[PDB]
Design a protein around this ligand. Structure first.
Ligand SMILES: C=CC1=C(C)[C@@H](Cc2[nH]c(/C=C3N=C(/C=C4\NC(=O)[C@H](C)[C@H]4CC)C(C)=C\3CCC(=O)O)c(CCC(=O)O)c2C)NC1=O
Ligand SMILES: C=CC1=C(C)[C@@H](Cc2[nH]c(/C=C3N=C(/C=C4\NC(=O)[C@H](C)[C@H]4CC)C(C)=C\3CCC(=O)O)c(CCC(=O)O)c2C)NC1=O
Ligand SMILES: C=CC1=C(C)[C@@H](Cc2[nH]c(/C=C3N=C(/C=C4\NC(=O)[C@H](C)[C@H]4CC)C(C)=C\3CCC(=O)O)c(CCC(=O)O)c2C)NC1=O
Ligand SMILES: C=CC1=C(C)[C@@H](Cc2[nH]c(/C=C3N=C(/C=C4\NC(=O)[C@H](C)[C@H]4CC)C(C)=C\3CCC(=O)O)c(CCC(=O)O)c2C)NC1=O
Ligand SMILES: C=CC1=C(C)[C@@H](Cc2[nH]c(/C=C3N=C(/C=C4\NC(=O)[C@H](C)[C@H]4CC)C(C)=C\3CCC(=O)O)c(CCC(=O)O)c2C)NC1=O
Ligand SMILES: C=CC1=C(C)[C@@H](Cc2[nH]c(/C=C3N=C(/C=C4\NC(=O)[C@H](C)[C@H]4CC)C(C)=C\3CCC(=O)O)c(CCC(=O)O)c2C)NC1=O
Ligand SMILES: C=CC1=C(C)[C@@H](Cc2[nH]c(/C=C3N=C(/C=C4\NC(=O)[C@H](C)[C@H]4CC)C(C)=C\3CCC(=O)O)c(CCC(=O)O)c2C)NC1=O
Ligand SMILES: C=CC1=C(C)[C@@H](Cc2[nH]c(/C=C3N=C(/C=C4\NC(=O)[C@H](C)[C@H]4CC)C(C)=C\3CCC(=O)O)c(CCC(=O)O)c2C)NC1=O
Ligand SMILES: C=CC1=C(C)[C@@H](Cc2[nH]c(/C=C3N=C(/C=C4\NC(=O)[C@H](C)[C@H]4CC)C(C)=C\3CCC(=O)O)c(CCC(=O)O)c2C)NC1=O
Ligand SMILES: C=CC1=C(C)[C@@H](Cc2[nH]c(/C=C3N=C(/C=C4\NC(=O)[C@H](C)[C@H]4CC)C(C)=C\3CCC(=O)O)c(CCC(=O)O)c2C)NC1=O
Ligand SMILES: C=CC1=C(C)[C@@H](Cc2[nH]c(/C=C3N=C(/C=C4\NC(=O)[C@H](C)[C@H]4CC)C(C)=C\3CCC(=O)O)c(CCC(=O)O)c2C)NC1=O
Ligand SMILES: C=CC1=C(C)[C@@H](Cc2[nH]c(/C=C3N=C(/C=C4\NC(=O)[C@H](C)[C@H]4CC)C(C)=C\3CCC(=O)O)c(CCC(=O)O)c2C)NC1=O
Ligand SMILES: C=CC1=C(C)[C@@H](Cc2[nH]c(/C=C3N=C(/C=C4\NC(=O)[C@H](C)[C@H]4CC)C(C)=C\3CCC(=O)O)c(CCC(=O)O)c2C)NC1=O
Ligand SMILES: C=CC1=C(C)[C@@H](Cc2[nH]c(/C=C3N=C(/C=C4\NC(=O)[C@H](C)[C@H]4CC)C(C)=C\3CCC(=O)O)c(CCC(=O)O)c2C)NC1=O
Lengths: 57, 174, 164, 112, 177, 177, 177, 164, 164
């Protein structure tokens, strides 16, 4: 017997399968109310303040 | 222009019985050797895709760091799913003796999809090349930790054939 | 559960006696069917989300009144609970193939379904419309083996007879 | 509604007569279905009595080393007599007066 | 067991004295407002099929972990047992409101129910909420203050009865706690 | 009530997952060794009456105080019960070997068996002696090492069932402790 | 209490016989792969806090009705004690692995756990889901099989230990189920 | 619950005594303070959804680095959890105004919140930056009285000096 | 302090018995790591002066917002303090891997650590980026043998399972 078969095949890694993007519609949906994150503004990184000496002022 | 199993959404099984295998085994030259080379891969299909994508991490540990692609355990499992599907069509391509279904259904557009999702192509070229170097040793039975029980003879013709299929995968995402 | 092992060990226990020679011929018949039944459980375990998607909306195509205000498919989230309600019954058919008997159906899916579906006003005729579609949309060599499709269809008629 | 009616279960406690019955049948009918939760909440608080006596010994053994506070022995075999005196008196304190029974209970439910 | 008439009888028997004409005035208003109490038990028991239905389905939508697998309302056998666990409780409240006393549920329903749910592993935080939902549906039915259904009554106010069934649905939730 | 096939669907019901091909291969190996199990159950139930006769009469001969006046097997009344206290155990053990799971005797034999013996004063050194003896006999019959009872089977290995039935008897001994 | 080296002694005291070649070579096979054993308990203690931080987050993500009020992980004090309940049961498994025998966790950890979880209103099936992930987290670390993190050892096989802790995590699970 | 009524009866219970009139002075202080404390809670019950959205926008404005991967704001489902984590605080701040004491806060939200935030790598520096934006831009004559703007704002910085 | 010797010498006194022959078997196991662990102590003691830089620079790559004004690394002198900070933790792994236990760490490094970090607002998740970088750096062929790679890498994993 040779017995090929074409079927949808996936794997997992310790808590979750691979096809969890396109879940069936009854499996997910309407669990909680949804927030929206605001725009976090990205500023530059600074320098220092040495002097261990202005820090009490 | 893909292959003779053109059938889409009707049953999907298509086994071959015993006497029709005798019409097939007396129709392929080294058809006994070709069936043992497929069965030396598909018995070891779980360990092949596990050692490949861990050895990809063992040479490139930047994909487990946040920002890397194989963070967020679904995406590691999606890389394990894509490692299986690259193996299962090449294990079909050794069986059929052609890369026509492989180049049309599996490798077609694989360069454009992986750059669409931000998949690193150079790491996946390393992932197929580990899967190339394993299946050479499985077919010629120079696999270290596990040796199969085959009949006597050589299989260096089929081992050069299966490296040609794995170089087509490395060409299609280069 | 009800299977071949639980049945002969119960009638042994309900008669105070060791496992006899007739208690081992029965489990011999579990060996002659497991290789023709576990591949029906194999096919259903990897193809469930496509067979529940098309069997779920075969009832909404049949009974289109359910998407009315005041009905069982009022909003979208009660439609999604129905797909969850149907993906349980395909999961228990999968468990009856693995155990061998019809224990997982008439102890987790059938027992108490009359009191629940009368109380919450859920029509059982739309359940058996979603299960009779799966039993008919099935080819014997294409979807399964020749005798795996006899096992899988023998449990899809246990649901339809139990919900009627 | 579930069925044609909703009668109470025969597994519910205090369901039989207990009016002019014998002593054997009186006690069988007052403790009908109450024996389970009496033994559930008997191993419950005994595990609580075993659990907080562990959580305070962690201070007695800080980071996996024993202090000078444990010291159950000083001479050869100086814990064997301490083994008996701690467990024989624990039975002596379980045959106390019936006035000291709830005096132990209501005062433990005062200071804690 | 003991209704409101035989409640004052056993209280007068501690004194072993005749029930006079100075203590039946609390009973004669209970007769004179008796036609309101028959008018209100009929308010509850005419739509008890939806009071128990709406309570359990409301208990589930706040705590959805009761139907996630292994849950206490997971299979159809657990759920259909809950929908009779929840209406036997309403069966004795409607008994207690008619008799005008709490002697029919504190001795036939709740005497022995606290140890039963901890035997079966039933959570109490869910079983409280299904009772307190049915409480708020009853005072919306004792007074004609419901949203979807209204009934036909005479003019008046029954806040003495609506405060009484609130005093019967909370001795449930405190006994099972 | 729960065999080896239903422990897999009990385990896979907590995940709410279909039984995949990963777990069916351990369950296909149960079927593939299915004839060795029926060749092993028959090797115990066919000489079961001699096993419990050997274990009780072997226990009393290494402890002759068990029949001395003040012992637990003094009269004929205490001896007829000892011969069936032991053969009730061995009957329920073979149910757990025939099924593949210990969920028959831990639900119908061993629960409450600890509290039963301490009220009677059945000694705990002797209850686990006779099931350490019947453990030695049961591993001597499934593998053909019985000295005067050579049943004929095929050639092969049965060390796997030599660990399965040998785990049950020291699970009874952990229960009557 | 007692390890495996003192388990073979207390099974032999009922035999009243010295220890010899009948029962020593399993302890010889303990020592001869003893370097494998404490090589395996290193790769549990080294990443134990990440295991339960993933196990309880994996528990809530499957059943999100545990953080809703009525679930037993609603309060922060309900969720802080969930870690330390789910850390001690992992800590007791690490004692059984090092000592070889599971005698330590069956009595100091599990005796009285089933009766307390149904006294405090702790959901049983939610904990059994959490300890099953810790079963899966262990065997992915004994054998270097986990995806995101691996470490370098001496080349060999360790399936005897990976099947041992799988027998150690369900005796926890059968004590709660 | 640590309310003023409980603290004066717990010391009354511990001394084995009756309710003395020294505690009755403290109950008189409630009904003077209760009117200037409940309308801080009544205005919070009608403004909670508009204040909890406006709070978390300064959480991500002061620290915009949380949108990086590996942090606590990389995907949408846990930014949704961030608004739920901070709504639960500003409900327990509403609950403690009605009681009058700090009872619900230090028992439900606070006790056990340290050893789970560093466990799941959540900083408290962004937690205290959410309510300090809420506690600042609120004009004491414009929204409520000059007394509720003192008493309610005395509850919000109770979190900050218990978390830092 | 914790070691092989001082742990097992305690139960001799705390149970009031002599030195046994089982504790004599325990120091024998310390001989098998005495020429197997101490090679890593002399390794890093001549190696810290270049890895205090590359593991001190390791965390600020992960967390560039510490050098931002306002937070705990707002000036240069704070970063002068910050490099001295991380030169106390693996200053103790030279003290821990010379003794045989976690003695210099469980009594000097973690005791009171979570309480001086909540009050002084030091993010504990940057120490997870500081010395666990050396865990992802360690080369068993080049730097030192796989006996340090199982023991120096173990003592680090003690610390990340302590500062989290
Ligand atoms: C809802 C959210 C959600 C999750 C958090 C995960 C949770 C999760 N992880 C694993 C499974 C696992 N979890 C871990 C744990 C870890 N991996 C590591 O290497 C670290 C040390 C540690 C995280 C810090 C490991 C090692 C496995 C096994 C390997 C794997 O499956 O990837 C499993 C087991 C599958 C089962 O249930 O049988 C689950 C549920 N899945 C989810 O759906
Ligand atoms: C090198 C180390 C070093 C420091 C870190 C500072 C610390 C510091 N700050 C102030 C100074 C002060 N500190 C406060 C108090 C505060 N204001 C607020 O709003 C906050 C909540 C809180 C600080 C967190 C006030 C009000 C003053 C006085 C006003 C001022 O000088 O700015 C003082 C008093 C000056 C003195 O000592 O005589 C000191 C020592 N000084 C040092 O030598
Ligand atoms: C788990 C169990 C399981 C099943 C029972 C089937 C059920 C099934 N069949 C088809 C799919 C199909 N089904 C048929 C049906 C038939 N062909 C014929 O010649 C007959 C007239 C008829 C059998 C009686 C055909 C022709 C297709 C291909 C697409 C279509 O026409 O629907 C599909 C859509 C996906 C696909 O194309 O595979 C599904 C879910 N599949 C499963 O996975
Ligand atoms: C490999 C490619 C392939 C084939 C060559 C055919 C197989 C095939 N078989 C037979 C020949 C036959 N076919 C049958 C038919 C049957 N035998 C039985 O025992 C059953 C009752 C029944 C259905 C299987 C019989 C009886 C013969 C004649 C004897 C024989 O040669 O087997 C013939 C005609 C004569 C011949 O050429 O041999 C062909 C063309 N099918 C294929 O797929
Ligand atoms: C952590 C770092 C890490 C790695 C870098 C890789 C190590 C690794 N091993 C192999 C190589 C191989 N891998 C296998 C696979 C297997 N052998 C079996 O017996 C099993 C059936 C199956 C899963 C274990 C085989 C058969 C070879 C070829 C034999 C060999 O070269 O050793 C290869 C491919 C050959 C090459 O091009 O170098 C690599 C990269 N694995 C790791 O873990
Ligand atoms: C049979 C059809 C089939 C293909 C032609 C290929 C192609 C392919 N890859 C992915 C999708 C993916 N593929 C990977 C895989 C990888 N990324 C890495 O970092 C590694 C190098 C590598 C694994 C070894 C990942 C991580 C995703 C998910 C990407 C994402 O979710 O953003 C998807 C899912 C997206 C979709 O359905 O639209 C598909 C179809 N895979 C298939 O299943
Ligand atoms: C393990 C076994 C198992 C099952 C078999 C189901 C059975 C089941 N279904 C529902 C619940 C439901 N079932 C349906 C299903 C349907 N309504 C329709 O329009 C159609 C007739 C049909 C699907 C096509 C709907 C809509 C609900 C929600 C009804 C409600 O509660 O208002 C409930 C109540 C609890 C809940 O809401 O989940 C239960 C026990 N659930 C289980 O746990
Ligand atoms: C006279 C008064 C009276 C009662 C109140 C019930 C009390 C009661 N309930 C159950 C039994 C039960 N009761 C419930 C009910 C619930 N569990 C939940 O999750 C919810 C909180 C709640 C309903 C919404 C459930 C789920 C069972 C389980 C049935 C089973 O174990 O199969 C049982 C045991 C089964 C039986 O004996 O039939 C009893 C005695 N019976 C009575 O005779
Ligand atoms: C998540 C799912 C979900 C629901 C299904 C509803 C269910 C629901 N309805 C009511 C509340 C009520 N439920 C009823 C019951 C009925 N009304 C009628 O007219 C009928 C006769 C009968 C059911 C058909 C009544 C009369 C009220 C009070 C009026 C009202 O507040 O709507 C309550 C009480 C609120 C509380 O706890 O205080 C709940 C939970 N709410 C939810 O959150
Ligand atoms: C056997 C069947 C049977 C019944 C159904 C009741 C029916 C009933 N209700 C009332 C009569 C009444 N019922 C009510 C009660 C109410 N009005 C409201 O608006 C509130 C919603 C509700 C409070 C519970 C009031 C206020 C009266 C007027 C008389 C009175 O107050 O005593 C009367 C006396 C006057 C009349 O005949 O009209 C009767 C017979 N009695 C019965 O014997
Ligand atoms: C002084 C009294 C005394 C006895 C009566 C015997 C009884 C006896 N036999 C065995 C040991 C055994 N007993 C049997 C039982 C039997 N063998 C057969 O062939 C029959 C079918 C069946 C008896 C009717 C078997 C099969 C073994 C193990 C192997 C063997 O000896 O044959 C043991 C276990 C030894 C132990 O404790 O570990 C004992 C106590 N021994 C004694 O010391
Ligand atoms: C209804 C009643 C019923 C039975 C009694 C058994 C009878 C039975 N046993 C075996 C078959 C067997 N039985 C054994 C068992 C053993 N051999 C040994 O050497 C060990 C001492 C002993 C272990 C217990 C083995 C090893 C085989 C052959 C299986 C194999 O070799 O793979 C077979 C298949 C091979 C054959 O005999 O043709 C059958 C039918 N089956 C049944 O259906
Ligand atoms: C000797 C061994 C030993 C144990 C096994 C545990 C057992 C245990 N758990 C808790 C107590 C608890 N344990 C949990 C934990 C959980 N609840 C859930 O829903 C989840 C399944 C799980 C988290 C994953 C919870 C929520 C409490 C309640 C704490 C409280 O009352 O506030 C308590 C004390 C009561 C209390 O904390 O108030 C004890 C002794 N402790 C020990 O010392
Ligand atoms: C009873 C009161 C009560 C609380 C106070 C919270 C406390 C809390 N928060 C989270 C869980 C969380 N809390 C946050 C919140 C934040 N992270 C950030 O980026 C910001 C600093 C902040 C939002 C402003 C996030 C992102 C998670 C998810 C972390 C995770 O699950 O891994 C969890 C884990 C369970 C869950 O995710 O639901 C708990 C118990 N929950 C409660 O039930």
């Amino acid at each position: 017997r040779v017995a090929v078969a074409f079927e949808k095949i996936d794997a997992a890694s310790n808590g979750v399968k691979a096809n969890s993007n396109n879940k069936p519609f009854w499996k997910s949906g309407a669990t909680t109310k949804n927030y929206v994150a605001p725009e976090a503004p990205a500023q530059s990184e600074p320098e220092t303040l040495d002097d261990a000496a202005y820090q009490r002022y | 222009a893909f292959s003779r199993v053109v059938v889409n959404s009707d049953a999907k099984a298509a086994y071959v019985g015993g006497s029709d295998l005798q019409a097939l085994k007396s129709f392929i030259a080294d058809g006994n050797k070709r069936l043992d080379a497929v069965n030396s891969i598909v018995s070891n299909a779980s360990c092949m895709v596990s050692d490949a994508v861990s050895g990809m991490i063992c040479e490139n540990p930047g994909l487990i760091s946040p920002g890397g692609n194989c963070y967020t355990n679904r995406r590691m499992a999606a890389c394990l799913r894509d490692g299986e599907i690259i193996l299962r069509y090449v294990s079909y391509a050794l069986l059929a003796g052609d890369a026509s279904v492989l180049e049309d259904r599996c490798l077609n557009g694989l360069k454009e999809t992986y750059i669409a999702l931000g998949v690193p192509t150079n790491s996946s070229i390393r992932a197929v090349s580990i899967m190339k170097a394993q299946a050479v040793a499985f077919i010629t039975n120079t696999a270290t930790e596990r040796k199969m029980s085959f009949a006597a003879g050589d299989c260096t013709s089929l081992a050069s054939e299966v490296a040609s299929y794995f170089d087509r995968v490395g060409a299609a995402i280069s | 559960m009800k299977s071949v092992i639980t049945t002969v060990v119960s009638a042994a226990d309900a008669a105070g006696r060791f496992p006899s020679n007739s208690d081992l011929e029965s489990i011999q018949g579990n060996i002659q069917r497991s290789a023709a039944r576990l591949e029906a459980a194999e096919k259903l375990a990897g193809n469930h989300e496509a067979v529940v998607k098309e069997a779920g909306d075969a009832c909404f195509a049949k009974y289109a009144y359910l998407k009315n205000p005041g009905e069982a498919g009022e909003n979208q989230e009660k439609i999604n609970k129905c797909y969850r309600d149907v993906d349980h019954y395909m999961r228990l058919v999968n468990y009856c193939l693995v155990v061998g008997g019809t224990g997982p159906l008439d102890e987790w899916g059938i027992a108490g379904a009359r009191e629940v579906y009368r109380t919450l006003n859920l029509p059982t005729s739309a359940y058996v419309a979603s299960i009779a579609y799966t039993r008919d949309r099935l080819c014997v060599p294409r979807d399964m083996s020749a005798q795996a499709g006899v096992e899988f269809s023998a449990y899809l008629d246990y649901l339809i007879n139990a919900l009627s | 509604l579930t069925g044609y009616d909703s009668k109470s279960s025969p597994n519910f406690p205090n369901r039989a007569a207990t009016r002019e019955r014998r002593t054997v049948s009186f006690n069988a009918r007052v403790a009908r279905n109450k024996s389970q939760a009496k033994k559930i909440l008997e191993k419950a608080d005994e595990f609580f009595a075993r659990s907080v006596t562990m959580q305070y010994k962690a201070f007695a053994c800080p980071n996996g080393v024993y202090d000078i506070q444990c010291t159950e022995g000083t001479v050869k075999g100086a814990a064997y007599e301490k083994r008996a005196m701690a467990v024989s008196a624990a039975f002596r304190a379980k045959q106390a007066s019936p006035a000291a029974k709830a005096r132990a209970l209501f005062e433990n439910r005062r200071h804690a």
